[PDB]
Amino acid sequence: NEFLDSQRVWAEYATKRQEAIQQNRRLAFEELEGSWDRGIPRISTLFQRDRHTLAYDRGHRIRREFKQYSLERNSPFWWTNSHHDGKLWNLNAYRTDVIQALGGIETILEHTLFKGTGFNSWEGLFWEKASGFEDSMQFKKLTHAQRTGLSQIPNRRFTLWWSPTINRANVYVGFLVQLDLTGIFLHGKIPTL
Amino acid sequence: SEEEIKKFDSRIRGILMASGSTTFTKVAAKWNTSLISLFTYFREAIVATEPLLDILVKGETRIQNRVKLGLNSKMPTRFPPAVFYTPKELGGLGMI
Amino acid sequence: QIIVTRKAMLDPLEVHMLDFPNIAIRPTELRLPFSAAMSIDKLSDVVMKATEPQMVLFNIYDDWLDRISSYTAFSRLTLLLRALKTNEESAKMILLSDPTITIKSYHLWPSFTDEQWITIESQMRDLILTEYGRKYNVNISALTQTEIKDIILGQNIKAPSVKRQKMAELEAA
Amino acid sequence: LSYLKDLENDRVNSLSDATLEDLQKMRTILKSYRKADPTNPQGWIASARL
Amino acid sequence: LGLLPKPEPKVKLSNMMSVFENDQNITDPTAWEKVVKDQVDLRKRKHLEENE
Amino acid sequence: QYKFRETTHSKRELDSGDDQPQSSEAKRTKFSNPAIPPVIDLEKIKKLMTVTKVSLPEGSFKRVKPQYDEIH
Amino acid sequence: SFIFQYYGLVIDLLLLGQERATDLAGPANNPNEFMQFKSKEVEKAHPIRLYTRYLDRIYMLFHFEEDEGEELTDEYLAENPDPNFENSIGYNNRKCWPKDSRMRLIRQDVNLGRAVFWEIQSRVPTSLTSIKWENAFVSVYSKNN
Amino acid sequence: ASVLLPQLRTGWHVDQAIVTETKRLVVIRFGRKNDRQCMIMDELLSSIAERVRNFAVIYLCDIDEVSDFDEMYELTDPMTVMFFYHNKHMMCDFGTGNNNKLNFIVDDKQEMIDILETIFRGARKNKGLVVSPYDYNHKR
Amino acid sequence: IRQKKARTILQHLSEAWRCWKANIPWDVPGMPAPIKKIIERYIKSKADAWVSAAHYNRERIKRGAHVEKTMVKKNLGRLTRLWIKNEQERQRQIQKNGPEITPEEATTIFSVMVEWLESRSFSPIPFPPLTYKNDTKILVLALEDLKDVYASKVRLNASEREELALIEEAYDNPHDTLNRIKKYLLTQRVFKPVDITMMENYQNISPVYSVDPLEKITDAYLDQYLWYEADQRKLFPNWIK
Amino acid sequence: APNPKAFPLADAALTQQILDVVQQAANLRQLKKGANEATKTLNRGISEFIIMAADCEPIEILLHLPLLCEDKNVPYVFVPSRVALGRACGVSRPVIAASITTNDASAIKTQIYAVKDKIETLLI
Amino acid sequence: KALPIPEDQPKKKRAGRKFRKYKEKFRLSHVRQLQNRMEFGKQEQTVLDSYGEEVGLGMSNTSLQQAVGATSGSRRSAGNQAKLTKVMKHRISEANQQADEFLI
RNA sequence: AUCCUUAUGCACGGGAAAUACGCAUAUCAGUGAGGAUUCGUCCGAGAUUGUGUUUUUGCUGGUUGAAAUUAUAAA
């Protein structure tokens, strides 16, 4: 579909260009909406702002391929190079759809501790990320154990968030031990939680 | 190709190992990237190849289990999918 | 940094400053005394005598920057403006204690000497403090930090709402 | 002494498609700008640009 | 193991705005300026005096 | 004054002789040991009086210790 | 990378010979689009219809007009006498594919394929690159496969 | 190692060792000389001991030769190690469940050091329990 | 005083193993013959066990069987070392018996190249001129590629930082950098030596060559230029990918 | 006592002067230490004057330099102390040969010339 | 050489234009802090870098800004712009000198 | 007596850097360290080893919290 569609939309683009020429115009990238995130390379290429520089980036695919010998951490996308090709996939739709599948945001939240945070709506919030947190406290004279603990930490948040559905009958079966002084029953030594 | 499938499997396994320290989220992200790589690049080919499909099934399961293990020594009956598939931004892991 | 005095100038300003993304629009905890622009005399006059939208320019540090530091100058301005805000007339009087100490044709403040300037500043400070005392019933002894806060910001102050206080207490116990 | 990533080597262009939610805020802002009397003109222009 | 002198903060016209150990730093702006400028002069004067 | 490391020491005697014209020898070791380490200073500590305010001058004692300038 | 490519060009030329490589290219003033040529006739000249290379992996597509293939097979036999027919065994297929629809190792076809690969091997020197039978995969299309 | 680590002859000796390290932590290895697992542990600890030196100390106990300390583990008696500070027993919660003693081989020298470090820290704090940085839950 | 001696001998044992791993001889002088022999024997035994063990581990990994999370890592080190040994041994062998291309072969293949070139009628790629038309752009491209790696990461190690700094310098004093590059191309026949960390694509590994950050810039430039230049002149046939 | 073949040996004051000159040259980069460097200088022609160490043992390792000087008409001395010479050069390690090199635009040209003259006087 | 007794001292407490800079190099920046915050609901903004698309800017980019386009207000700092080592600097200087010589 | 050069020492002042900066009963080192090269030659001063700190030494200040708290005495 992508290759046939590429064939199509490039022809279309060419036609458009010809038309523009006939009517003396630079080709309006406003018109190419519809056939924008299609084609290989994408029509998003042609009107990227670094077009004329990337003209000289040649033997680029092969260079990318040969990164398996230069940079160590190894590349799950050696094949395409965003610049010269474009977003060769989209998965934005996917994120949207997954939420829907799990009864929308609200439903998802109702799994999580969220309502415990006691906000009216969710519009105004933000998370502090885990990687960021790790980074922040990895500028200190920390003995390896400490570092490990820090690394672990970004779970001791995730777990808590998902607590109220990692800590019920159906998820884990067994005891129901009372966390001391509190009406909070575990369903297992989910130690972080 | 068999070889590519094998490579994919290895990648999954790699992700799974070196997890002890590594966060659930990071691991999940890695998995996503690997799976995205697999899919975006072959696309058509996966739906035919049954072995690859099987691997994907199992790989995903393994990934889920790592998280489960982290959460509790005892394996659960089952989580909801929620924790795994909910997006990073709603506090999930964002497995694709 | 476009620092803004009012809290909610950010959004509209931000919108109008996408074209200059280098620029970073900062709110502030300081109740800065630029609301006392109209307490200044020449400026006020110019505002009055506009028949139209008029972009108008002033070295609000008139004869200052060759004599004292930029920061120093700004501090002085803050002191004076604050005083003006508190009670304009008093400030004016202070400025115009000596009629020999005139205001030039292109300035907005009474071209003093350095000792004189210092004295004026002191007077202004006194006015600020005394006025504050009169207003919000407080002993003028305080701490130097507190005094500084009062002058610079006239800020909200660490004013924990009753609820907050209660929460804190709970946490403590 | 893993050092900090030189701030100005942060990632810049060819980003993901802008989020509907995000866009809506902008739209709202522009509506406010417009509806709070016309500029007269530039508000409309700004909206168009957006 | 002495406290025979004391060590103060070496202000300048670039510090000026950032030192708070000595008082009056925004309180009495021009007084503060005088103090800091004066201090600087003394330092310079001291150097010159030493040379002399 | 001496620039190019003044003069050498075969047994130090030569150096001493050289110094002789300058003529000021043993005072500057009663300073140099106080600086080159402060062990002498430490010993001394384990004091010193100025012409203070209201000396009288019947009063005659002044110690020093780092939490406080203890006057007797 | 560039160096590697250049080196492989030498090897490519050897594989293709000067003449066939040239044909594949087209002329210098007006080069060809990958896999195309100018004429149907220059396509149908040498065996080597398409050729390509992606790094180490080369991909030569040969054609043969029955008789030619037979001749090649005969030559191969002469060089390497194959009485016991240890040739469908000792060969590679795409063990991925079904049983049914991989290279039917139909003796003659197998022989042809092996002959072709032998020829290819002969074409390039050893000392630049070991081209091994193990590593090669020589699908044959025919009346059979 | 045999030559690297110091070994104990009798229960009294062991007790003395446990008591008399005020500053350092004390890892004893209770194990039968000729066993695989025990040997491995000793090898690991040989490496670690020098490293951790200024904070911990490693010792060895032939459990068959010195049978005084079958109070410690109710006669389970696999080839274990135990952690001590100010003559208090120090409790290192892994997954395993045996919070008392690590009755299992760890292979990452660094990992071993880290756990020792953790326990030292715990001891200094005054804590009896300490959660290991690592999990385990494989090597029972 | 035997304990001390034993301890010493332990170190010797360790050190010969280390040497073997490195791939350096254990030509210790004052050691007595039979002890030395014993040590050698031990080392041999280790090798027999060690290499084989590594291979087994690798096989297991390939299978996807079950293997300890540190064991695999260990194997990868050991395996890497073995690979290195093999490669350097290969090199040594080559050195011993001359270049595997005999002259006739060379003549054949060189001739093939030359004739091809003639057929294609190829203007050779000239040295990057002192005032090259597409110089600056090329340089920029090179630097971008170098950067690429970091664009993600939030911390940097030291080497990485150094590299980044170099890149910045190149950007910021472009002319100077260009000059340096040119000089290197002209002259520099010698180089800071290259360390080879090994990869992890488990089912088959190797090799990541870490060149010194400075040389890298020059190399990058060269890569950019040749690939550009070749493309401009059609050195590479339509077929090559 | 110093070697006979080390000739011309300076006198004390002269020696001191020479060392001062050396020091000056060292600061101004107008000197080269070391037998081999001295030799190089001589070959070039850049040597204004050569300073050797009498207390070089084994003296032989210098005693080409004098010959070279003679054949190039560069004046030369030995000083007595190789340690001293080394120090002057700016080297803790003890040195045997140095060369004050030529350069018209030296501040210390005049001083150097004086020393050269002195050296010449010694020679005969 | 042994590891040091792990004690947990907090003695330092320093600050000072002079000392800030140094430490500014190691501190996370303000834009990095911003990045580390991710808006809650939204599909939060990612830069697809060819080597790895993974990277989320995060709440560095302002809502409105995000909706439109990029920012150089978040190219803020001079106090962590990767400077060379002593060695590296020296090497570069040497190279420059060589180049100059060649040019003559 | 006036002006300048070099080195140093003391300092004002202005900067950059600390991934740097030391130390050594060590081994070697202008009687050649380590490097260049157009291959003719050229530069000429540390190197090796061990090791102590090294997201930093010493000091100050604030806000805070911490919970931050008020002498005796006669009718």
PDB file of C-alpha atoms in Angstrom, chain J residues 8 20 22-23 25 32 38 46 48 61 64 67 79 83 95 106-107 109 113-114:
ATOM      1  CA  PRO J   8      89.461  26.361  28.238  1.00  0.00           C
ATOM      2  CA  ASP J  20      73.915  34.221  34.113  1.00  0.00           C
ATOM      3  CA  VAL J  22      72.739  30.986  29.953  1.00  0.00           C
ATOM      4  CA  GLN J  23      69.913  31.637  32.399  1.00  0.00           C
ATOM      5  CA  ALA J  25      68.917  32.765  27.210  1.00  0.00           C
ATOM      6  CA  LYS J  32      69.753  24.886  23.783  1.00  0.00           C
ATOM      7  CA  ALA J  38      74.835  21.802  20.997  1.00  0.00           C
ATOM      8  CA  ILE J  46      73.134  29.203  15.176  1.00  0.00           C
ATOM      9  CA  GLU J  48      76.894  31.979  19.338  1.00  0.00           C
ATOM     10  CA  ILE J  61      81.490  12.582  25.441  1.00  0.00           C
ATOM     11  CA  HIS J  64      84.117  16.463  20.082  1.00  0.00           C
ATOM     12  CA  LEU J  67      86.783  20.318  17.932  1.00  0.00           C
ATOM     13  CA  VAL J  79      82.599  25.771  33.231  1.00  0.00           C
ATOM     14  CA  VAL J  83      74.993  20.699  38.270  1.00  0.00           C
ATOM     15  CA  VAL J  95      73.868  18.989  32.127  1.00  0.00           C
ATOM     16  CA  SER J 106      67.506  39.677  21.533  1.00  0.00           C
ATOM     17  CA  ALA J 107      67.311  41.975  24.466  1.00  0.00           C
ATOM     18  CA  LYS J 109      72.350  40.403  22.529  1.00  0.00           C
ATOM     19  CA  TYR J 113      78.367  39.347  22.906  1.00  0.00           C
ATOM     20  CA  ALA J 114      80.308  40.351  26.011  1.00  0.00           C
TER      21      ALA J 114
END
